[PDB]
Structure 1
Amino acid sequence: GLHPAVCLAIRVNTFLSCSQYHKMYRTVKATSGRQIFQPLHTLRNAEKELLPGFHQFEWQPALKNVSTSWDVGIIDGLSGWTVSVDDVPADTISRRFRYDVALVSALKDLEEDIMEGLRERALDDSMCTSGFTVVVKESCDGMGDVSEKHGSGPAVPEKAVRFSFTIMSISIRLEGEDDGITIFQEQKPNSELSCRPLCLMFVDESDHETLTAILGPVVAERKAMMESRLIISVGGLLRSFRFFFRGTGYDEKMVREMEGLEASGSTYICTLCDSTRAEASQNMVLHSITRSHDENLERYEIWRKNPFSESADELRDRVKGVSAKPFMETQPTLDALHCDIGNATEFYKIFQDEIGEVYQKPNPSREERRRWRSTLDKQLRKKMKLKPVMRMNGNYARRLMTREAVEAVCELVPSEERREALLKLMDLYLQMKPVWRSTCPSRDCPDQLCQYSYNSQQFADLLSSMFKYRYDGKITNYLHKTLAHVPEIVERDGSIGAWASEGNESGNKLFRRFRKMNARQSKTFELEDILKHHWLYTSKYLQKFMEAHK
């Protein structure tokens, strides 16, 4: 017959509801069997191994303010809310894995592949056990429009925030004095099967009380985790690891309320640097990264305290937009996806503006503006094959950003110098497009990384020259970032778009199916099985069972 684990992989990888899988199993058993598939119960006990709270492990030194028990599974995210009618309400439904246990079950999942690396690298598998380093991308995204279930209660919001992490790489260092050798480097970080769901809530991310009240313990786990080395028995030998966290693949609204900024359309645009709106439109390309987490903290402390006794606006100008207190560190960087979409919405604006001629008529009425858009979308429907979307998805963004698509707009634009202007513009943008999209720019697209700065100078001078009528005193957030800070963060991090929110947001799609297809389903246990089945979806130990190579 079939091995139980292999079968279980057949199940979770093909998206099979346990009910549906029991249907199939029963059938093939009763009809010409001699059963092949293993019945539900052996599957259920076979997956005990994969889920967190299985493999025994220990940190050194022991974590500050964390439980030492390693067998703990799904926990209600409340983390002890005393549910007094008098106190803050219990409204939230949440289920999360305790961070470190999730981490070990995700990494002990890669034991085979890190052994693979150690063998392939021609390193001794027995030698150098303690010199491991592990780079991990954490991510968080809110997802609206989640149907509430009738249930027993509690009455709970229709928004759901989903929080996850992906293991990007593991590299040896010790002996020392080296680059460190990369044992494992994830091939497709932009895949949903590379993303392991950590936590599940029903909360709006604009509701700060509740969100901080759930995610607080998690962040604590992080601040502890940055120090101690992990210790796991792996591949037969007990080895010691390290952990590097990159908070990345957040949308900007989320960065700003989590990094405690004033958001998102204010006169202080950039997360990374202090430049104002008009100040940034004045000179675009030249900026240096300044603001970080520790900085945001000291800034809050000099806002809340306000030692020099400045009034509202001068104080707001001293701290450059730090009002709220940041509770979470985020490595400074630009999301590939949302920046792409942002630039595409700005270009949507520009195209709209060149349908009629809007630098000749400084303030046109709303009517012929709607008229203009209808023109633009009729055209974009004909050529480029594009439905007039409500909110702009990244797919649209990728389809409209081409020389090819810009051509469709070139047709309507009345004059030649403008028609040529936005074409030249798009060419300039596409030459700089892969640097924040492509996985590893250093190699994949070397010259476009080499020539970026000059090219952005070109672009910005095109704006300042022929497009100034729009960009006189203003420029968008993301467009600013992409015309300023790309070279810096690439030559620092080494990659961008490798760190993209793409992996995480895609995860949201899975959530929905899992909630609908693989849930209980009731408000008591839903997140239980969503989170479970999802974590079982991402596991490489099942996935290479599904490879069954060739």
Structure 2
Amino acid sequence: GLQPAVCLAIRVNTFLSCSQYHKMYRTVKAITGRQIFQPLHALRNAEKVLLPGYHPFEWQPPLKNVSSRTDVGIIDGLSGLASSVDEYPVDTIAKRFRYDSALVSALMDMEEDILEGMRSQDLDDYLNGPFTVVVKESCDGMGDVSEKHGSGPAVPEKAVRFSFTVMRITIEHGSQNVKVFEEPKPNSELCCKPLCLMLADESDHETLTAILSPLIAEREAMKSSELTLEMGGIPRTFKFIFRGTGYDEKLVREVEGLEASGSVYICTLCDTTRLEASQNLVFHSITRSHAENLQRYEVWRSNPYHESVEELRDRVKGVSAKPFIETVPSIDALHCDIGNAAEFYKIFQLEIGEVYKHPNASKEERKRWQATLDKHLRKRMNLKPIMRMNGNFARKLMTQETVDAVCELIPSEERHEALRELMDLYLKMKPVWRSSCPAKECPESLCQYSFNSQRFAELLSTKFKYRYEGKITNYFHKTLAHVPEIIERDGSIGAWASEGNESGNKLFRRFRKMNARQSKCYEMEDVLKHHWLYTSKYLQKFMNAHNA
């Protein structure tokens, strides 16, 4: 005999579809003669407890503009958007949970973990003290999502996903707050719970705003409120702190009202021009926020001081749009690594062509330089050339062996020394904005970070001025300037990266292909439900039943 919950856990964790599981169950029953696996209807009955809209809960004070019903599941992401022929065209299929139901479902899944942490922290396991749940929000935009035939809108070939992850829960027990749950693998796809799936372009601001306005409305509603929920007997109270740091640079620019990527104003944390960043390179402070962006947009619209276009753009630094999502200013570790890799790749191409003494080169010779670099990299580091830049290429490129292999193509030796020093400094600085707990994992590296940043900036301005003189890269600026301050503010950079959402995109593609109905009006619902079930600690605990 085997329980329906365990059968469901096996099915959802070993990438099994309902049809394949039906085949397995039928064959096992026919041969053994005894019903070992539970049938499909039993599994789908057992899956209702895990999904949202099952457990009662209360909000005090009640959420503004949010329904008080506690039995809402998968709802339309358009949120009543008008589809009449007279109004603006709508070509988008969106499905979402409710933000106040997804949270209670996640907490009820983590009930056992919360109780275990309470017991292991020497606290009594009946306290109803107000917990503080920190939740990290990620929004990602996938391309090359093929559309389907059939009735429905002319939906584009792109998708947008909005997800959240519970990071930390703390309880106040006197003069100090003590932890009862900390996520061990924050960047894993196992803990990244989907909240909204839509098929629309990331650059389509009207559609993106129309779909994501209800979610932001709910989130702002439950910032000042307390949630009462019965968790294993006693009812307990929860608060929430939302930290949206899983966004990429382009999406932060779009949703915080800042201008497009190519502009004089480069950093999304401070307000410094590219030339000023190239001249300073080290000393900057974080002076940007959602409220400041709103005020600056108001200044831009009103033009109270009667300034020309250029003077107004200087006054309101890059805020030519009105923000609509509050994001914490931080650095995405994955994209920072990729950008640094691309910059170093271009540095190698320039160095194997001796641009430091030949300022001008033909367009047909830089291609030859790139071809030589690609051939030698394949020969030595076993890396094939790729079109864009991904993380694995960055990890295999930012090693010292790559520099040693590349130096065979550089005629000079002082260039060898300069490039080796640059790579050593970069590798010394990297584990600070990539580890999950720098104070307990790389303390010497964290302490010796300002010195290494200054040395890196000096080397960049002295021995690489042919590319960095009046122009610096956004990621280089962020890495050299804001990393110690962000570490001091938060605790870790890298535990708040977009890695979880990027990993979940793979699950999204796999589920849309072989775990969801192929109709145009059910695929998003099926994918959302299956993804939520996959990211469930109650089910994942059974797969670790061998060791206990």
Match of 2:363 among 357, 361, 366: 366
The answer for the alignment partner of 2:184 in structure 1 is 187
- Once residues 333 and 213 of structure 2 are traced to their aligned partners in structure 1, the CA distance between those partners, rounded to angstroms, is 27
Partners of 1:497 and 1:148 in 2: how far apart?
A: 34
Q: Which residue of 1 aligns with 2:229?
A: 232
**Quick one: which of 482, 487, 490 aligns to 1:485?**
482
Distance (whole Å) between structure 1 residues aligned to residue 537 and residue 490 of structure 2: 26
* Residue 455 of structure 1, aligned match among 452, 459, 469: 452
Residue 132 in 1 paired to residue 135 in 2?
A: no
Structure 1, unpaired ranges of 5+? none
SS in 2 for 1:28: helix
Which residue identity does 2:514 align to in structure 1?
M
Matches within 5 A, 1:93-104: 93-104=93-104
**1:5-84 pair list within 5 angstroms:** 5-84=5-84
Q: Does 1:213 align with 2:210?
A: yes
Map Cα deviations across residues 457-497 of structure 1 (whole Å, 9 max, x no partner).
00000001111111011011111101111000001101100
> How far 1:174 sits from its partner (Å)?
4.1
- Aligned pair partner of 1:283 in 257, 280, 283: 280
Q: Cα deviations across residues 300-354 of structure 1 (Å, max 9, x unaligned)?
A: 0000111111111111111111101100110110000000000110001101111
- Aligned 8 A contact 1:334 1:481 in 2: yes
Q: Distance in 2 between matches of 1:109 and 1:363?
A: 62
1:261-276 superposed matches below 5 A: 261-276=258-273
- What residue is the counterpart of 1:162 in the other structure? 161
Cα deviation digits, residues 200-223 of structure 1 (max 9, x gap): 000001000000000000000110
SS in 1 for 2:166: strand
Match of 2:143 in 1: 144
Match of 1:355 in 2: 352
1:289–1:485 CA contact under 8 A, matched in 2:
yes
Deviations 1:253-297 (A, max 9, x none): 000101110121211100000010011001101100001110011
Identify the residue that residue 252 of structure 2 maps to in structure 1.
255
Q: Could you tell me which residue of structure 2 aligns to residue 446 of structure 1?
A: 443
Is the contact made by 2:188 and 2:503 (CA closer than 8 Å) also made in structure 1?
yes
**2:106 corresponds to which residue?**
106
Asked whether the 8 Å contact 1:131–1:174 carries over to 2, the reply is no
1:469 aligns with 2:444: no
Identity of aligned residues (%): 77
TM-fit CA distance, 1:80: 0.5
What is the letter of the counterpart of residue 284 of structure 1? L
Q: 1:511 aligns with which of 508, 519, 524?
A: 508
Corresponding residue of 2:528 = 531
For residues 90 and 278 of structure 2, the distance between their equivalents in structure 1, rounded to whole angstroms, comes to 46
Query: Aligned partner of 1:66: which letter?
Result: V
- Which sits farther off after the overlay, 392-401 or 211-220? 392-401
- The DSSP-based 3-state class of the residue aligned with 2:190 is helix
Query: CA separation in 1, counterparts of 2:157 and 2:429?
Result: 39
Q: 1:546 maps to what in 2?
A: 543
Equivalenced residues, count: 547
Residue of structure 2 equivalent to 1:123: 123
- Secondary structure at the aligned position of 2:431 is classed as coil
2:370 is the alignment partner of 1:380: no
> CA separation in 2, counterparts of 1:36 and 1:406?
58
Q: Which runs of 4 or more aligned residues in structure 1 lie more than 2 Å from their structure 2 counterparts after TM superposition?
A: none
2:298 alignment counterpart: 301
The separation in 1 between residues aligned to 2:374 and 2:299, in whole angstroms, is 49
Pairwise CA RMSD: 0.8
Deviation at 1:532, TM superposition (A): 0.4
Runs of 5+ consecutive residues of structure 2 not aligned to the other structure:
none
CA-CA distance at 1:90 after TM superposition? 2.7
Listed one character per residue, the Cα deviations across residues 12-50 of structure 1 (whole Å, up to 9, x for unaligned) are 001101011111111111112212110100000000000
1:257 and 1:263 in contact (8 A); partners too: yes
Aligned partners of 2:129 and 2:172 also within 8 Å: no
The answer (yes or no) to whether the contact 1:230–1:241 under 8 Å persists in 2 is: yes
Displacement of 1:130: 2.3
Kept in 1, the 8 Å contact 2:134–2:169? The answer is yes
Amino acid at match of 1:539: S
For residues 484-532 of structure 1, give each alpha carbon's deviation from its aligned partner in whole angstroms, at most 9, with x where no partner exists: 1100000110110010110111110000000001111111111010000
Task: Determine the C-alpha separation between the residues in 1 that align with 2:346 and 2:497.
Answer: 25
Alpha-carbon deviation of 1:82?
2.3
Measure, in 2, the Cα distance between the counterparts of 1:310 and 1:351.
Answer: 45
Contact 1:159 1:202 in 2 (8 A): yes
In structure 1, distance between residues paired with 2:7 and 2:18:
12
C-alpha contact (below 8 Å) 1:352/1:373 kept by paired residues = yes
TM-score w.r.t. structure 1 length? Answer: 0.98
Amino acid at match of 1:454: F
Identify the range of structure 1 (357-366 vs 337-346) with the bigger mean alpha-carbon deviation.
357-366
Distance (Å, rounded) in 2 between the aligned partners of 1:94 and 1:398: 36
CA–CA distance in structure 1, aligned partners of residues 170 and 381 of structure 2: 44
- Distance (Å, rounded) in 2 between the aligned partners of 1:97 and 1:413: 56
State the distance in 2 between where 1:18 and 1:8 align.
10
Shift of 1:359: 1.6
1:52 is paired with a residue whose SS is coil
2:337 maps to 340
Aligned equivalents of 1:82 and 1:329: distance in 2?
A: 26
How far apart, CA to CA, are the structure 1 residues paired with 2:203 and 2:436? 31
Q: Distance in 2 between matches of 1:314 and 1:363?
A: 36
Q: Deviations over 1:65-92 (max 9, x none)?
A: 1111111010110111121111012311
Query: 1:214 & 1:32 partners in 2: Cα distance?
Result: 51
Cα distance in structure 2, aligned partners of 1:208 and 1:143 = 16
